[PDB]
Design a protein around this ligand. Sequence first.
Ligand code: LPP
Ligand code: LPP
Ligand code: LPP
Ligand code: LPP
Ligand code: LPP
Ligand code: LPP
Ligand code: ANP
Ligand code: ANP
Lengths: 98, 98, 258, 258, 262, 262
Amino acid sequence: QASLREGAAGELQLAGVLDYSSGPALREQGGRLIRASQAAELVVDCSAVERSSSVGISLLLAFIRDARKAGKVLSVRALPDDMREIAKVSSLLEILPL
Amino acid sequence: QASLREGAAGELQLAGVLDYSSGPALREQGGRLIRASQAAELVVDCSAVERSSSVGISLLLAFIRDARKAGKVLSVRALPDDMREIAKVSSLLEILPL
Amino acid sequence: SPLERIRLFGRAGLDVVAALGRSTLFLGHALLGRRTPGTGLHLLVKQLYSVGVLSLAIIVVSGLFIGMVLALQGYNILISYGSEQAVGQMVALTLLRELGPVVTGLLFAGRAGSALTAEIGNMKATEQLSSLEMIGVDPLKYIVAPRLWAGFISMPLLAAIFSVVGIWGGAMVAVDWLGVYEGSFWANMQNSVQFTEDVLNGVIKSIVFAFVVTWIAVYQGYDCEPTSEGISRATTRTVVYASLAVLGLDFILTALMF
Amino acid sequence: SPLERIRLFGRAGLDVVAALGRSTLFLGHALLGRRTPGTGLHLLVKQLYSVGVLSLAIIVVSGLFIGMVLALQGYNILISYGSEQAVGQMVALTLLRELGPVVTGLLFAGRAGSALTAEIGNMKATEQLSSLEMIGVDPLKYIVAPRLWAGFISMPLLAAIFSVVGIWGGAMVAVDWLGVYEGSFWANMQNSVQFTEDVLNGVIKSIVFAFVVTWIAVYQGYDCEPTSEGISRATTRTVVYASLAVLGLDFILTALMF
Amino acid sequence: AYAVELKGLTFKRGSRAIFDNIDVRIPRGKVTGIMGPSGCGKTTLLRLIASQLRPSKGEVWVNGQNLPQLSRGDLFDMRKQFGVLFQSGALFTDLDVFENVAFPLRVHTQLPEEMIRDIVLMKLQAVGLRGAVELMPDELSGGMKRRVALARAIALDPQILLYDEPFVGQDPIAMGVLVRLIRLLNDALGITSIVVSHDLAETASIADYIYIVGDGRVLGHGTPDVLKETDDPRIRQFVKGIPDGPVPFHYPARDYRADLLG
Amino acid sequence: AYAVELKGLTFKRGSRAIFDNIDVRIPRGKVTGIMGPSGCGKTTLLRLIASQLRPSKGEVWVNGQNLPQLSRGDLFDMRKQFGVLFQSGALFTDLDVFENVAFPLRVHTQLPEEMIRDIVLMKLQAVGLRGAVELMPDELSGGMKRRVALARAIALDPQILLYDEPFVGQDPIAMGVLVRLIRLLNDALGITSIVVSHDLAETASIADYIYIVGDGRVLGHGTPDVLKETDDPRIRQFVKGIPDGPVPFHYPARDYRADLLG
Ligand SMILES: CCCCCCCCCCCCCCCC(=O)OC[C@H](COP(=O)(O)O)OC(=O)CCCCCCCCCCCCCCC
Ligand SMILES: CCCCCCCCCCCCCCCC(=O)OC[C@H](COP(=O)(O)O)OC(=O)CCCCCCCCCCCCCCC
Ligand SMILES: CCCCCCCCCCCCCCCC(=O)OC[C@H](COP(=O)(O)O)OC(=O)CCCCCCCCCCCCCCC
Ligand SMILES: CCCCCCCCCCCCCCCC(=O)OC[C@H](COP(=O)(O)O)OC(=O)CCCCCCCCCCCCCCC
Ligand SMILES: CCCCCCCCCCCCCCCC(=O)OC[C@H](COP(=O)(O)O)OC(=O)CCCCCCCCCCCCCCC
Ligand SMILES: CCCCCCCCCCCCCCCC(=O)OC[C@H](COP(=O)(O)O)OC(=O)CCCCCCCCCCCCCCC
Ligand SMILES: Nc1ncnc2c1ncn2[C@@H]1O[C@H](COP(=O)(O)OP(=O)(O)NP(=O)(O)O)[C@@H](O)[C@H]1O
Ligand SMILES: Nc1ncnc2c1ncn2[C@@H]1O[C@H](COP(=O)(O)OP(=O)(O)NP(=O)(O)O)[C@@H](O)[C@H]1O
């Protein structure tokens, strides 16, 4: 599936396929397993994403609740195409800061 | 209302308003009260008809069942306008011989 | 909210209040309103068929079973007292003054108290009940008046038929299967009947909650909101209430007379 | 045509034939098919509420009325025999071995045997019951299995509650209104009970046509054709049959044991 | 000059104020089709102008006199003037097709039981359901189950007649024959017809002076043309797709940011 | 190349032969709308290609594999691919709106009960019924009672989805928002959608490759254009008004002369 990596110094790398299967594991291994250790200014960038459904949208979403709850600020980079559209439908126009 | 007259020698005269009220009386006073006495070739002509609904259509219709049952042949003349249309709707295209 | 919870409770109070008020108004309009153009008696015949006759096989078979159960219970309840042959004065007194009409209610109010509500409910829901007015006939006299009349003049006859078949089945099991003696049965039975005082009692009891059953069993059908869920709930309200009222008025009508 | 009339009669024969065949298949699939994804126990709780609890006020009030009627009938039936104080061994034996569970059936099969059929009928009719499959859950295990379980584990408890309230009401009228003596009542009662032999008899009797009632009362709801008239007729078929079967199996179950 | 006019009419169902001092004026001979949003109270307007539902206050002039102020013996006679065709037919499940269509005659008129049969037959031919003069409506396919109702309506030859959502939910062949009949009856028999349909397309196609009823007040009216460019935001939102306008698209939520975040 | 294809499919309900060796082939990404006359068996086709109804013989290729020949443990996994939106919503009267929309997730996926809430919320926003995340469907106005069902469908992001008479019987504002959504989902999410509507107008408006199902056999098919002038009497009678044609207008009566006369 996909995976998470590159913590404590921003640059949250995201791997290929974020589906309902690979969802919860990534959520839990990112939300506390990573966001407890970060310094600040979390750049989550979806470079190596193969294919993702709304589950990935809600994932990068949960990536924001904790960071806001963790005080530190975060933003997204390199938003993929299908994600771009799944955000386009349910507005998420600015709620996905890039 | 309306009425019936001029029997035994064709020329069945029909009066003004043939409605649900004036219906049955005309039916009974024509069907047997007149068609039992006729010679033949019954010309039923609707000259002095004011205003009639489908009840009048079914009346001139019953005027034909008995005549056919009475052997003698009949036909209609001077078909009024509203009758013309009420026949136009439920075809009665030729079943009203004129 | 608890205060608003009690508000809703009280609203339901006023609701059943106005409900049966409107119900009695409805009943008045139905039985004594006017005489409609398109009425007659053939309506009553068709209804009386649909309500009584179709609901007759049920109460026949049910009378059979409840009678032989009453026997098989009396025989064994009383053989422990020696007065075995007296089973006739049981299976024909309980099945005739109290249990007869009560079960006949719970069954008539079960089937013909429901498939009578669903009928005039469905009528209201496909607007069929409404186009009658746009024609001009008063529905409360063409649609429901024959219902009420098929009620009042069927359920008592049904109670009688039920009691008869019940007694006969009780005998048939007692005579042929229990072995108790033939003539003794009918003898002790007729010696302990008090016609005008038990039989007529049971019949007036039958009539009163015949009226009461087929009164709600048709009102509810007239009032239910027009939707396939509304009718599906009214044909349950008219079994809840049609059994509640059957038993309640049985209780009152038997306190009027022991 | 008479020959074709008998053809239709025989077609109805094969129809009820295949009907209850399919019914037993349905029951098998429901109770022993698989384990579905979206099932649980909270479903059973919600159902058991909707089926038992809501149908509890009815049988409480009905037990009250039928108990005091049983008394007011026994007192007067037996004062003509002197053994007046023995009313306890009547109002507590008839209300506990035969009439208890029978009336509890005719009421449970009246209300919760119907507003349970109309429920899963309506479900089928708004296609709600079908989109479950397009999702993937087996309805016969998510929609009807909790119905069957709320049936089997409610109607017996309801029969017990009914019998209790019935006995208590019978006492309350006998003691306070008839005046018969307090201790004598419970005394003759307990001296004539035969727990494992009457009480357990009544309870197994309750359970068996609990199963039988809430079996048809849900099958019919699953089979009814989806239209507001179809459901309105199924919720009557499931009172006809749910009373027929109540009384029939009461008869058989009391011939198994007098 | 007008077949039906509704002066100062208001109606409240449980003080909900269904209708609220309205004024509609139907021209005779012309098929007018009233409509409006969901739950906007159209069928209520039907049962009003057909005098099944007693108005709160106002008057309904109908071909002369007003109804709520008439004697039962005269109201019944007035009933001969206006027919009503519900959707779902509204046939009597008790009586077969023939008796069903004859019913209004067997009510308002005393005709030799043959003559009733002939009127029924000619009407059923006019609507096409002449063959199934024996079927019971239970046996009748849901489509023609409406055309027979229409024939029952046009029985007695009423001068005006109402349509409760006629062309709603049927294959375009049945919809086509029905929209041909509801127009044939008007072009020939010259009888006022009041379609009442949520379906905008076919209504505006056939209608002559369409209304729009909303929240107890007529939301304007006009012939299809003037109505196609009224520029009244409410109306122009209705008569076109344009989902977002005076009638909101979204529900009154709190915040798409906070709720999903907090 | 095709999302759904139906090779050699036939179906009989009590040997009535509902479907009879048919071949339909749906292209992916394109909204195709199948339809046909009354009782022509469309919804049956739905429950078939959604594998609620077991076909008699034939195969239904769906995004690869065929369904009737799959293991329950795998069929259930396939269920994640196709959504279905009935008319009348088909909501669970037991559960409130929120739980109702979440249901498919709570079935096919094990997500932190927060994350389910966020997916439900974004979907409800996409459909607009975000505010009524508390109402019970019993409380919900019949219009939005369908849009919530649509949101439930688009949950899990299925790649194809079915519509059982979506735009049937609602005010043109609700019909407009729905026809905007069923098209937005296809233009954006690039998901195959199969409208199934008796309504010809809007179907042919939005659809791409419409079919026509009649008496167990596909009565041809095409894009709207070719279909508007197929000149096949059956079809050209269907897709236009033209009430009299292969489907008769009148019932099989005996004689308009004899019966009324003799
Ligand atoms: C001061 C007067 C003003 C108003 C007074 C009205 C109150 C009287 C009516 C009582 C009914 C209240 C039930 C409402 C609760 C509810 O949820 O409603 C319960 C149901 C309806 O419930 P739903 O609407 O929720 O389905 O209503 C009923 O059960 C109706 C049956 C009640 C019995 C009617 C006849 C009364 C018999 C005599 C009383 C016996 C008492 C013995 C005393 C000696
Ligand atoms: C060894 C012998 C034991 C035989 C066991 C058979 C007994 C059980 C019979 C079931 C009862 C059927 C009633 C069902 C309700 C119903 O049909 O519902 C009523 C239906 C309703 O008709 P509709 O289709 O029009 O709605 O009416 C019928 O069509 C049925 C007519 C006849 C059904 C049989 C009823 C009378 C025969 C009873 C036999 C009793 C024997 C007497 C013992 C000595
Ligand atoms: C549903 C089950 C049916 C009930 C049967 C259960 C057991 C029977 C009742 C117990 C009472 C008998 C014990 C006393 C022994 C004795 O000496 O009883 C036997 C005595 C002996 O005297 P006789 O020889 O003159 O008959 O006789 C009597 O007691 C007369 C009463 C017989 C019953 C007639 C019917 C009246 C009963 C009530 C009818 C309605 C109530 C039923 C529903 C509430
Ligand atoms: C130990 C003391 C016992 C206490 C006695 C009190 C109870 C008495 C019997 C209870 C009656 C059942 C109530 C059912 C009504 C209800 O639930 O009320 C609820 C329903 C409607 O309520 P909803 O529509 O809101 O659900 O009521 C109705 O359907 C309308 C009609 C009610 C029927 C009343 C019957 C009166 C009996 C009159 C007999 C006299 C006639 C004889 C003339 C020859
Ligand atoms: C003296 C004034 C009292 C008048 C009567 C009071 C009526 C109160 C009814 C409320 C009862 C519980 C309702 C709960 C709601 C629910 O969930 O359930 C409500 C149920 C049906 O449920 P639904 O809401 O789903 O329809 O309705 C009922 O059936 C309620 C039946 C009430 C019958 C009252 C009859 C009076 C009792 C007579 C006893 C006599 C003893 C006297 C000896 C001296
Ligand atoms: C300890 C012993 C264990 C006992 C085991 C219990 C077995 C219970 C089996 C009963 C079957 C229940 C039917 C299920 C509901 C259903 O789907 O059945 C529904 C179908 C009807 O289907 P449709 O109407 O939809 O076509 O059939 C029925 O209606 C069944 C009617 C039930 C009648 C019961 C009568 C039994 C008594 C017969 C005795 C004859 C006496 C004669 C002597 C003189
Ligand atoms: N007897 C009644 N009691 C309470 N509310 C009613 C009653 N009849 C109708 N209503 C409500 O009042 C309105 C009238 O219903 P209806 O006649 O269908 O409205 P409409 O605008 O004319 N047509 P529609 O948009 O399809 O509802 C609806 O909102 C109903 O819910
Ligand atoms: N379970 C069933 N048992 C018997 N007949 C059925 C059953 N399901 C459907 N039918 C009939 O078979 C046909 C299938 O119904 P349906 O799916 O609505 O047809 P459709 O052509 O796809 N759509 P429609 O034209 O609205 O009926 C109809 O004629 C139904 O009467």
